[PDB]
Every structure is written in C-alpha cells, then in structure tokens.
DNA sequence: TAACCGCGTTC
DNA sequence: TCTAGAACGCGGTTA
C-alpha cells in the first residue's frame, strides 16, 4: 500500500515545482504530423531539457508511472511536462513451442497486478545461430506502475526458485507450465532510465513538447542559461572539536547567484555588521558581495530560504555540501521549527544526499573525486582552486573561526566569501559544461550523472546500444560464494595485470654525458625496416600518400647516416635525450584492435572466425585439501552460534541454520588456522597460462561503444595538444593571449581526463561486481597483450639506448643525442608532416607484430555476408626531450623503486612528480618539505659530482635541523614539520584487533576529547612519536598533537600515562619528540633519493652523515 | 626474514 | 543499494 506515500510525494512535488515556476504543461491537440520535418507547424512548446524525475500521475485507482521533464523555454520562463510509459520486464522460456502456455499461466497467475501481455523477439548473443537471424522469443509483461511490476517479481520469485530445485515425489513408477519459465529478464532497469532509453530523450538537448511526443530541435545549438547558485556556510565550533548541528549554530552563509555575491550573518555570533566588499581573486572571477546582516540564526535560515525562492535556481552547487552543509542547515532548520522541504523543496534521499525536484544539487566534491584525476592530497577546495582556477584562496585555521566571529569579524567574512567565489566558478568553468554535455548521451539526470560510478555510466552507455540494436540485456552477474582449485578453497582470483620495471636509478640531465653501448644488429634491423617504417609514418601515422611528399629521400638519407654512424661507433659517451613514449588509450585500443568484448569470448562449445589469445590466471587458495575442509565444517556444525536480535526468543541457532554466507565466513576463519598449524602457510599462489577463443564475427555492440567514446575523448586530447602548441608561439610579452591559451589548455586537458576515466572503465567494467557483461578472460587478455607490446618496445630501446623506468604502456629512456630524432616531411600543399623517428620505429614494429588480420565485419546484413580486414589502432606517443630525470633506489640490494621519479622541463619547471610522499595525502610533513626542497636542486651543478654536492648541501641543512633536536626552528614551524597526518578510511570501532599509529592516535584522541571524535569515518589523525616508553613499539608511542593545545592539567595527565612516566613534569613538545626516529626517517629518504643512487653512478657518498647500507660498503670495497 | 595489512598512489 | 581493474611503496606488525 506504499503507493499512498508515493502518490503523496507526487502532489507535494507538484506544488513545490509550481511554486518555483514549473507548472505542468500540456500541448495542444494536433491531427496529422509533419514527422519532425516541419516542427514549426506542430503545436506545442519548445524548451531546453534541464532535469527529469520518475513520478506517479493520476487519471487527470492506483498511480500511473510516468516521468516529469523540466524545461527552460526561450522566453525566460520554465515549465515541466510528463510522459507516462508502462514499466515492463520479460519472461523467457525453455521451450519456445509452448510460449502461449506460459502466457495463459501468467495471465491468470499475475492477474492481480498485470496490465498487458505480449510476445516479442530480441537477439540473444548467448544463443546458437543468432548471427543468422534467429531470435529469442520472450513474453513482455507491462504494468500500470512500478509497484505493480514489483509485486509481479515477488509472485514470480517462487516459480523461479522452485524450478531450480528438483521435482517432487509422487508416483515413482511414472515415466509443467511453471517449469517452462527459465528466467525473468530486464527487470532491474531504473524506470526513468527505461523511459530515457526507450524514448531517446536526453537532458541537455532542445525539444518541442507536442501531443505526439517530444521532437528534438536540432537547430538549437547552445545550452539554455539556467540560474545557478553556489553556497557555503560557516559554523561555530568547540575548540579542537567538530561542529555539532545539535549545539553549534550557523554563523554565516555566503553564496553566489549567476555571478552576484551575497553574505548572510548571524549577528548573535558576528560581533558587528559587515559592509559590502569585493573579493575578485583574479580578473576572470569577479565577486561583488552584498551583505545581509540578520538578528538571529533563524532570520538567516529564513532569508536564505526566501532568497532561493525568489531567484529560483535550477542548479545549486556546493563543495561537500551533501555531507556537511545541507545536513547542518537541515538540523538548524528543525531546531527552529522550520521545514526545509516546504520552504525550498530540498530533502534527504535514500543515500542521505540532499536533492530537489526542480533543482540539481551539484556537489563539486563529487566531480573532484571522480573526474578530476587529482591525487587525494590535492582534493581539498584549496588545492583544487590552485589547480583549476589558478590562484590561492583565503585560508583560515578552523580553530580560529569561532573566536574571529568576535575579534576579527571582517577577516572571517572574507574567508567565507572566498569559499563561495571558488565554488561558484569551479562549477561554471569545469563541472557545468562537462556534466550537462555528458547528459546529452548518458540517460541519467544531472544529479546522477555527477554521482554515479564510472562503471555504471559505461553500463548506461552500453545498454542504450544493446536496446537500439534489439539485443536482450543479460542479467547482472553474481559470483559464487565459494570457488575451488585443485580441491583447495580459493581466497582470491584474478589475472596478471600490467608489467612494471625499474631499470636504472640516479640523476640524468641533458647537459651531463652518459655511456651508451649500441647493439650493431639493432641498427642493422632498423636500417632494414627504415624504408617501410617511414612509409608507415606517412601513410598510416599521417593519413597521406607518399606520392604527395617531396622530401622522403632526403629524410631517409639523413636518418640512415646517423644510424650507420651509430653502427660503426657502438661505444659512445654523449649527452642524453631524456624521452618518454606511451601508447594512447592502450587497453581500449587493444580491445578495439582485437575486437575484444565479453560476448566475443567463447568456449569450445560454440564456434578462421576465431582468434585465440592468451592470458595469465592467478589464484590464491588455502593449502588445505578437501579432506581438511570437510573436517573443519563438520566440527562447525556441531557447534552453536548466536542469533540476530529479532525477538531474541531463540538465542542460539545451528551452523546449518546460518545463511550460506555467514557459514563460509566461519569456515574461512577456521580454515586459515588449520592451514597455519598443519602447513605453516595460509595462502598459496599459482599462475596458469590460459587461452580463450575470441570470435571475430560477434555482434560488435560493445567494441563499437568503446570506439565511439575513445574517438569522443581523442577530440579533447587533440585540442589540448593544439592549444599547447599555440602557447609555444605566443610572444612572452602578450600576457592576455598567453593567459587565454593556458586557460584553453587547462580546460581541454580536464575534459579529456574526465573522459579518460569512463574510457578506461569500459575495461574495468568486465570485472565489476554486478556487471551485465562480465569476463575475466577479456580483461586478462587485454593485460597480457599489453605486457607483450611494452616488452617488445623495451627490447628495442635496450639495444639502442638505456631504458630508465617502464610501467604498463610507457617507457622512460635516455638515447644518444646522435640518435635519429625529429623530422618534417613536406607536401606539395606546402604543408608539413611531423615525424619522430624513435616513435615510428616502435610503431612500425607494433603494427608488424600485433595487427589483427582476422577482423570481421558484416558487409551485407540482409544476406549475412562478412568481409575480413586487418586492424591495428595501437600507437606510441612521444613527449620530450626533458632537461632532467631523477629515479630513486631502494635501501635493499638488487631491488629498484617503481612508480617514483621527478622530471624537469628545459625551462627548469617540474614536468612530472610521481609517487613521492610530497604528493600523497598525509605522510610526515618533514619528508614532504625535504622532498619539495631537494628535487629542484638536482638541476644545479656543472658535473655529475657537483649536482650531487649541491643536493648534499640541502640534505646536511635538513640533517642539522634534526641533529639539533629542533632547536634551529621556531615553535610554529616545529609543530608543522614533525607532524604526520594519516586518514582512517573507516571508524575506529571497525579496526578492532589491529595495531597502527592512526589507530592509537584515534583512541587517545577519543579518551581526551570524548567519544564523539570517533563517531564518523575519515578521521584525520595528527600525531608525533614520543621517545618514551623506551624500546616500545612505535604504534604505542603515538601522541595526538591536539593534546599540546589542551590545558596544562590535561596535557600532563595524558602525557604521563601515554609515556608510562608518572613523574613527568616537563611537557615541552621538544622534549617529547623521539628525535632519533625522525632523524632515521629523514636519513632513509636521503639514501633512496641521493646517496644510494649516487653510489650506483660511481659517486662517493655526497652525504657522509648518512651511512651507506652495509651491502653497498662491501660492494664499494669490491 | 617473509607474509601480511591499510593507505594512496601509477598505470 | 551501489559498486571499473591490477601493480606497487612504505611503515608497521606478525609468524
Ligand atoms: O585510472 C586509470 C588509469 C589507467 N588505467 C589503465 O592503464 C592503462 C594505461 O594507462 P594510461 O594512463 O597510459 O592510460 P591510457 O593509455 O588509457 O590513456 P592515455 O595514455 O592516452 O592518456 C589504460 O589503458 C587503462 O587500462 C586504468 O584502468 N585506470
Ligand atoms: Ca599519455
Ligand atoms: Ca597510455
């Protein structure tokens, strides 16, 4: 009977919408049609589609499912329109010769909730002979609304459950319509996604609502201009503690409406009225802020709600507003007897996010986490503003925010508006164009397009294609509760992913010679391949004819000469070329090249239409054999287990009464212990080579969806490379032009990077839980192929140069300056073709060794005729040459360090900085600052020994800081440097049984500040390591730095018990710090970045105060 | 020592 | 309910 609540919400939403200018519009009647050819003559209204929501409508007894669509018109007004559409799923049969039987069974069995029945045909990619036109026969079950559809699923669950079970026991001497139901299908499609897909409607497009439906107005090009408001709030706060919406009250609310700034103040907390002021952190971001000082907090909550009602925003944007700002304003509204939904139409949703019917809530944080590609350390509003808006916003320590309401109130106003300027323009520059454009192709509304996982976005895109090609959707994948290998229970199953190598360490610089030993057979091969490789660079890499180039031979001769010189002088000590090569969209292009897609992976049971590809399976299993497993369970059955507290009338249940999941949880725990006793090992690992069949004839709907999105991405990655090149030839004097070029660059890279995460997710999606297109084989094939390609490239670079570091699809290397480099073909059109020889020599080899010659495509669909061709879309790309590269080395002999290095441009600026602490969220501030100081110094010096000598100067300076027990440092700089901040992904309660510095810090912080400091997840534990108790585990000597900001009685009490020293009177933070700990951690960074690499390049220890690992001293001593 | 865990990276 | 993947570094505990 839940329809009541739903039908109620519909009326509430209807009146809220009408208050905000969204009245239900019904188009005039029209007999005939010009069928979208002359829309101007069909009566109705034109609007820009800005939102959509599933609703329930009435006849105008049960509700009628429909979708509301919210439009902005061309006359400055708004309106909504409603489409009704019967929900439906399918029933499949195990014998299509009796489909009519099931029809009469379900017609009567589901008669309580069924509206209509119908037999339809779709294409099943899991059905034999489906490539010849055979189709699966199905019964389409339609309903008046989604509640009825659900009742049908409930009534149908037994039939499917019993049929999977065996038959009952009647006349054992004897030797049906229910068992004809094999499965239900397409039952879990969100209703509004279903309407968007079946009706081809998309938010962000222009339509004309007519009686015969929405007609797309392909003439309108640009988006409408929705009213857009972004807001932030500031609240009071107990010292060292978190805001409490039950106690703490809202001090101010700053916001921005279409570029106008406003600030509301609670004068009961703000010491004085605020005057209108301007914060324009850069000319591109204006900000004139009008003030609304109000008497009490309630007055502030009521002006905000009224201002919102007046301006009518169809977009409201925040930064983490879903889990801080909105629930604060909501609780403060409740306390003061105010109802947020009746005032502004906003309320929490089933996930606790704050949503509205007429207005999308665009929480910019969600874009940052999903689409920005920023490291976690740079995902705060400050770091984002620096990266994406190009300026430093106002920063105020939060402990100073409550008092500065009284002492320095205008300052606290400026910070408040600073967060509002940054949020508004972050939205309009980055989030608004991306999300509203993405809605034009993905069938979600703006709120869901912003928030859903990128694997789900992929699934949305894939479902559109499958529907439009009349392909029946597979049900969501479900992996089994137990898997077995060679009789062992498996703990983990996966494939071998990317191939990573650390090959050299140390400093490499464009002005410092290096020794190269060049393989003469390599130059022989390159010389043999050269005429065709250059023909490949022209014809394939540049889509042009060799007949229209006019300097082919001159380039062939010039390249050949340098090659022949390298073959005669194999040994050389020259200046290096620090180059990088990476395959563009490697896994997508491997997939599209090999025509990889989950429906294409066949067993011997079905199906040269077949291309065999190899992958590497890796399993992790217990060493226990099934004999031991069966024993462990039986024991568990004889034991007794507690019960869920429904009633607690029965307070014990047997093992076999536990859910199958909870059963194996106990089996798993018990089995780990048995293996540790009888085997002394818990998990065993094994890799197996596997070969899968990839049909090259399968319906390529998945492969083609990937191609489309890759090409969609390539647009922006190419505009990015264009505008980057423009900025190369803008006169340094022309500031405005250079500023505009850079702005274009940062936008297009952001757009290409946001498309990147969806693109790569088309690969991850085949391994995602709940995937409608799951295939481990396809993922494992993708990876092994990529490992084979990059290792082929490494083999060649090895023989003509020195590869430095290698990761999945990319190689950093140095090559002799004398190696053939960059050339420019010339055409009769006067145009030039770029050529980088090191890129093309690889690409000609990739296309020689990894092209799919068995690619097949339907040429004549009516007669089912296929035409085979060759396909290869895999290409390395080149960037460089660079001024410097710095690769660290491990403290452990023979090992490398992967995924960490610094790279510098010729202009001296940082090109890349991968992996290091400096960039990761948290870590120990000292190591962060030391790293930031050291990397630029590697460019100084005139020789390899002087470069290291210069860096060494910075080290010994940093060492003096800690050898002096922090005496050379003021207190402010001391707390910052020696602190370490770590994050707790869950709450402390869920870490029970584990020891960590974050765990210890959380516990101590809870005892001192109360339990309410642990209640939530994501807690930031800021600690220092104390000297005492001496020789104790570091996890036991971890003090939260908040104690040092507490009252002396508190400080001594906790510091005494934390150090196990009840005589402690001396609370100076300097005396508590375990300086030998930090001295060793700083020293450990120094070895890996400076001293041990220097040794590997034959340079005596530049920092003698950091002693070499014993193994190195021995090797040094030969 | 080697296995193993939580976090946050590079792909 | 909703949910892209594997390989790796590093401080830290534990067999
Ligand atoms: O977030 C990510 C990044 C990378 N990857 C995986 O790493 C592979 C190589 O990582 P890359 O960063 O090189 O990505 P890419 O080749 O797809 O894109 P561009 O170089 O053109 O910028 C990708 O093909 C993908 O499979 C992910 O799965 N997820
Ligand atoms: Ca790249
Ligand atoms: Ca790549």
Author numbering: 31 to 90, 111 to 225, 234 to 665, 676 to 1186
Question: What did the article's authors report about this structure?
Answer:
The Saccharomyces cerevisiae B-family replicative DNA polymerases, namely Pol ϵ, Pol δ and Pol α, have been estimated to incorporate about 13 000 NTPs during each cell cycle of the yeast genome, and Pol ϵ seems to incorporate the majority of NTPs, roughly four times as many ribonucleotides as Pol δ. Our data show that Pol ϵ discriminates NTPs through the concerted action of a steric gate residue (Y645) and a sensor in the finger domain (N828). A comparison with other B-family DNA polymerases showed that both Y645 and N828 are structurally conserved residues, thus reinforcing their functional importance.
To test the hypothesis that steric hindrance does not allow the finger domain to adopt a completely closed conformation when a ribonucleotide is bound to the active site, we replaced N828 with a valine, which is both less bulky and unable to form a hydrogen bond with the β-phosphate of the incoming nucleotide. The N828VPol2CORE-UTP structure showed a ribonucleotide bound to the active site in the presence of the steric gate, Y645 and showed that M644 provides stability to the active site in wild-type Pol ϵ. The 2′-OH group of the sugar was lifted slightly upwards and away from the Y645 plane, but without affecting the finger domain as V828 remained unchanged in its position. When replacing N828 with a valine, a ribonucleotide is accepted by the active site. Despite an upward shift in the position of the sugar moiety, there is no clash between the V828 and the 2′-C of the ribose that would induce a strain in the finger domain.
